[PDB]
Motif scaffolding. Structure first.
Motif, PDB file in Angstrom:
ATOM      1  N   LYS A  46       0.842  -1.191   0.000  1.00 27.65           N
ATOM      2  CA  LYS A  46       0.000   0.000   0.000  1.00 27.65           C
ATOM      3  C   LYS A  46       0.880   1.244   0.000  1.00 27.65           C
ATOM      4  CE  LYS A  46      -3.640   2.278   2.742  1.00 27.65           C
ATOM      5  NZ  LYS A  46      -4.713   2.036   3.746  1.00 27.65           N
ATOM      6  N   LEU A  47       0.525   2.237  -0.824  1.00 26.27           N
ATOM      7  CA  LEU A  47       1.174   3.543  -0.807  1.00 26.27           C
ATOM      8  C   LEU A  47       0.134   4.656  -0.844  1.00 26.27           C
ATOM      9  CD1 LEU A  47       4.205   4.770  -2.851  1.00 26.27           C
ATOM     10  CD2 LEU A  47       2.067   6.045  -2.918  1.00 26.27           C
ATOM     11  N   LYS A  48       0.329   5.673   0.005  1.00 27.16           N
ATOM     12  CA  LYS A  48      -0.433   6.918  -0.010  1.00 27.16           C
ATOM     13  C   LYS A  48       0.524   8.105   0.048  1.00 27.16           C
ATOM     14  CE  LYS A  48      -3.867   7.121   2.851  1.00 27.16           C
ATOM     15  NZ  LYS A  48      -4.720   7.029   4.072  1.00 27.16           N
ATOM     16  N   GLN A  49       0.284   9.129  -0.775  1.00 28.79           N
ATOM     17  CA  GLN A  49       1.251  10.213  -0.939  1.00 28.79           C
ATOM     18  C   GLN A  49       0.521  11.517  -1.245  1.00 28.79           C
ATOM     19  OE1 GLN A  49       1.797  11.908  -4.160  1.00 28.79           O
ATOM     20  NE2 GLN A  49       2.921  13.237  -2.745  1.00 28.79           N
ATOM     21  N   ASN A  50       0.707  12.530  -0.390  1.00 30.24           N
ATOM     22  CA  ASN A  50       0.236  13.898  -0.612  1.00 30.24           C
ATOM     23  C   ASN A  50       1.438  14.833  -0.708  1.00 30.24           C
ATOM     24  OD1 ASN A  50      -0.492  16.589  -0.278  1.00 30.24           O
ATOM     25  ND2 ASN A  50      -2.036  16.191   1.299  1.00 30.24           N
ATOM     26  N   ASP A  51       1.530  15.606  -1.801  1.00 31.09           N
ATOM     27  CA  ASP A  51       2.472  16.725  -1.923  1.00 31.09           C
ATOM     28  C   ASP A  51       1.723  18.037  -2.161  1.00 31.09           C
ATOM     29  OD1 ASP A  51       1.953  15.130  -4.277  1.00 31.09           O
ATOM     30  OD2 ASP A  51       3.205  16.552  -5.391  1.00 31.09           O
ATOM     31  N   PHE A  52       1.712  18.908  -1.145  1.00 36.26           N
ATOM     32  CA  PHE A  52       1.018  20.197  -1.188  1.00 36.26           C
ATOM     33  C   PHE A  52       2.047  21.328  -1.105  1.00 36.26           C
ATOM     34  CE2 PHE A  52      -0.989  23.905  -0.258  1.00 36.26           C
ATOM     35  CZ  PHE A  52      -1.547  24.109   0.986  1.00 36.26           C
ATOM     36  N   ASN A  53       2.100  22.187  -2.126  1.00 42.67           N
ATOM     37  CA  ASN A  53       2.842  23.444  -2.070  1.00 42.67           C
ATOM     38  C   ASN A  53       1.907  24.641  -2.227  1.00 42.67           C
ATOM     39  OD1 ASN A  53       5.553  22.216  -1.953  1.00 42.67           O
ATOM     40  ND2 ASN A  53       5.139  21.611  -4.076  1.00 42.67           N
ATOM     41  N   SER A  54       2.237  25.745  -1.547  1.00 46.52           N
ATOM     42  CA  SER A  54       1.500  27.003  -1.692  1.00 46.52           C
ATOM     43  C   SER A  54       2.439  28.197  -1.573  1.00 46.52           C
ATOM     44  CB  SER A  54       0.391  27.111  -0.642  1.00 46.52           C
ATOM     45  OG  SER A  54      -0.190  28.402  -0.651  1.00 46.52           O
ATOM     46  N   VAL A  55       2.477  29.044  -2.606  1.00 45.08           N
ATOM     47  CA  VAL A  55       3.116  30.361  -2.551  1.00 45.08           C
ATOM     48  C   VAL A  55       2.033  31.438  -2.559  1.00 45.08           C
ATOM     49  CG1 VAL A  55       4.590  31.996  -3.763  1.00 45.08           C
ATOM     50  CG2 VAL A  55       5.258  29.587  -3.612  1.00 45.08           C
ATOM     51  N   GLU A  56       2.030  32.304  -1.542  1.00 45.63           N
ATOM     52  CA  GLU A  56       1.254  33.543  -1.532  1.00 45.63           C
ATOM     53  C   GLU A  56       2.198  34.736  -1.451  1.00 45.63           C
ATOM     54  OE1 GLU A  56      -1.760  33.779   1.532  1.00 45.63           O
ATOM     55  OE2 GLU A  56      -1.562  35.965   1.617  1.00 45.63           O
ATOM     56  N   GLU A  57       2.099  35.655  -2.421  1.00 45.54           N
ATOM     57  CA  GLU A  57       2.905  36.872  -2.448  1.00 45.54           C
ATOM     58  C   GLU A  57       2.025  38.111  -2.583  1.00 45.54           C
ATOM     59  OE1 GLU A  57       6.755  36.389  -4.162  1.00 45.54           O
ATOM     60  OE2 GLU A  57       6.025  34.915  -5.617  1.00 45.54           O
ATOM     61  N   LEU A  79      -5.092 -14.876  -7.114  1.00 47.27           N
ATOM     62  CA  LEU A  79      -5.859 -13.644  -6.998  1.00 47.27           C
ATOM     63  C   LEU A  79      -4.900 -12.468  -7.084  1.00 47.27           C
ATOM     64  CD1 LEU A  79      -8.287 -11.827  -6.275  1.00 47.27           C
ATOM     65  CD2 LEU A  79      -7.923 -12.453  -3.893  1.00 47.27           C
ATOM     66  N   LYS A  80      -5.169 -11.549  -8.008  1.00 42.18           N
ATOM     67  CA  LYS A  80      -4.336 -10.374  -8.244  1.00 42.18           C
ATOM     68  C   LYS A  80      -5.233  -9.145  -8.268  1.00 42.18           C
ATOM     69  CE  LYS A  80      -1.035 -13.052 -10.994  1.00 42.18           C
ATOM     70  NZ  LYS A  80      -0.245 -13.119 -12.254  1.00 42.18           N
ATOM     71  N   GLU A  81      -5.156  -8.332  -7.219  1.00 45.83           N
ATOM     72  CA  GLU A  81      -5.869  -7.065  -7.132  1.00 45.83           C
ATOM     73  C   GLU A  81      -4.893  -5.905  -7.264  1.00 45.83           C
ATOM     74  OE1 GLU A  81      -8.449  -6.799  -3.780  1.00 45.83           O
ATOM     75  OE2 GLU A  81      -8.708  -8.969  -3.613  1.00 45.83           O
ATOM     76  N   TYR A  82      -5.191  -4.980  -8.174  1.00 46.00           N
ATOM     77  CA  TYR A  82      -4.373  -3.797  -8.401  1.00 46.00           C
ATOM     78  C   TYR A  82      -5.239  -2.555  -8.270  1.00 46.00           C
ATOM     79  CZ  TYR A  82      -1.333  -7.297 -10.581  1.00 46.00           C
ATOM     80  OH  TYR A  82      -0.550  -8.399 -10.843  1.00 46.00           O
ATOM     81  N   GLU A  83      -4.731  -1.544  -7.574  1.00 49.20           N
ATOM     82  CA  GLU A  83      -5.347  -0.225  -7.571  1.00 49.20           C
ATOM     83  C   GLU A  83      -4.294   0.839  -7.825  1.00 49.20           C
ATOM     84  OE1 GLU A  83      -8.099   0.740  -4.476  1.00 49.20           O
ATOM     85  OE2 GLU A  83      -8.351  -1.360  -3.888  1.00 49.20           O
ATOM     86  N   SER A  84      -4.660   1.841  -8.622  1.00 51.67           N
ATOM     87  CA  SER A  84      -3.922   3.095  -8.674  1.00 51.67           C
ATOM     88  C   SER A  84      -4.916   4.241  -8.753  1.00 51.67           C
ATOM     89  CB  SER A  84      -2.967   3.141  -9.874  1.00 51.67           C
ATOM     90  OG  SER A  84      -3.679   3.055 -11.096  1.00 51.67           O
ATOM     91  N   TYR A  85      -4.578   5.361  -8.124  1.00 52.93           N
ATOM     92  CA  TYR A  85      -5.322   6.589  -8.356  1.00 52.93           C
ATOM     93  C   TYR A  85      -4.379   7.781  -8.316  1.00 52.93           C
ATOM     94  CZ  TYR A  85      -5.443   7.882  -3.367  1.00 52.93           C
ATOM     95  OH  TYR A  85      -5.116   8.238  -2.079  1.00 52.93           O
ATOM     96  N   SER A  86      -4.729   8.799  -9.096  1.00 49.49           N
ATOM     97  CA  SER A  86      -3.932  10.005  -9.251  1.00 49.49           C
ATOM     98  C   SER A  86      -4.828  11.227  -9.108  1.00 49.49           C
ATOM     99  CB  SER A  86      -3.222  10.033 -10.608  1.00 49.49           C
ATOM    100  OG  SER A  86      -4.140  10.279 -11.659  1.00 49.49           O
ATOM    101  N   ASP A  87      -4.319  12.240  -8.412  1.00 43.94           N
ATOM    102  CA  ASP A  87      -5.069  13.449  -8.102  1.00 43.94           C
ATOM    103  C   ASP A  87      -4.150  14.639  -8.327  1.00 43.94           C
ATOM    104  OD1 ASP A  87      -6.623  15.499  -7.208  1.00 43.94           O
ATOM    105  OD2 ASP A  87      -6.924  14.722  -5.179  1.00 43.94           O
ATOM    106  N   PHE A  88      -4.661  15.669  -9.002  1.00 41.99           N
ATOM    107  CA  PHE A  88      -3.873  16.854  -9.321  1.00 41.99           C
ATOM    108  C   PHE A  88      -4.823  18.040  -9.204  1.00 41.99           C
ATOM    109  CE2 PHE A  88      -1.826  19.179 -13.200  1.00 41.99           C
ATOM    110  CZ  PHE A  88      -1.563  20.270 -12.406  1.00 41.99           C
ATOM    111  N   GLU A  89      -4.644  18.839  -8.154  1.00 41.11           N
ATOM    112  CA  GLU A  89      -5.317  20.122  -7.989  1.00 41.11           C
ATOM    113  C   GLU A  89      -4.320  21.259  -8.161  1.00 41.11           C
ATOM    114  OE1 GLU A  89      -7.792  20.730  -4.627  1.00 41.11           O
ATOM    115  OE2 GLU A  89      -8.747  18.758  -4.735  1.00 41.11           O
ATOM    116  N   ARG A  90      -4.678  22.239  -8.990  1.00 42.60           N
ATOM    117  CA  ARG A  90      -3.906  23.460  -9.160  1.00 42.60           C
ATOM    118  C   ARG A  90      -4.809  24.677  -9.005  1.00 42.60           C
ATOM    119  NH1 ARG A  90       0.046  25.097 -14.341  1.00 42.60           N
ATOM    120  NH2 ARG A  90       1.640  26.135 -13.068  1.00 42.60           N
TER     121      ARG A  90
END
Lengths: 47, 50
Positions: free
Chosen positions: A25-36, B34-45
């Motif tokens: 299992k992998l979980k990963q958050n990368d949050f950057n914020s610049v306010e000028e 039994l082979k279970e795979y998950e991926s998810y991707s999130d991009f907020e700008r």
């Protein structure tokens, strides 16, 4: 008929199990914020 | 003719003449995969100018 016959031996049963579990299992958050801000005020002393 | 004794468990069988052997060679093989795979991707700008 094969290559050999059985001169002696033993009879019964055989049981085997191989069992294998693999979890990653992998979980990963990368949050950057610049306010000028820049702001300026000018006037002689009228303006 | 036949009439040789042949048994499986407590039951006795008449082997046909044509048959050389019918014999309860008993075996079992099981396979589970039994082979279970998950991926998810999130991009907020966010971009803001004033």
């Amino acid at each position: 008929y094969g290559t050999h016959y059985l001169q002696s031996g033993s009879l019964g049963g055989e049981y085997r199990v191989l069992f294998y579990v693999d979890s990653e299992k992998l979980k990963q958050n990368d949050f950057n914020s610049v306010e000028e801000k820049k702001c300026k005020s000018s006037g002689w002393h009228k303006f | 003719g036949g009439c040789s004794p042949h048994y499986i468990l407590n039951t006795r069988f008449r082997k046909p003449y044509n048959v050389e052997s019918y014999t309860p060679q008993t075996q079992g093989k099981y396979e589970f995969i039994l082979k279970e795979y998950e991926s998810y991707s999130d991009f907020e700008r966010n971009v803001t100018e004033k």
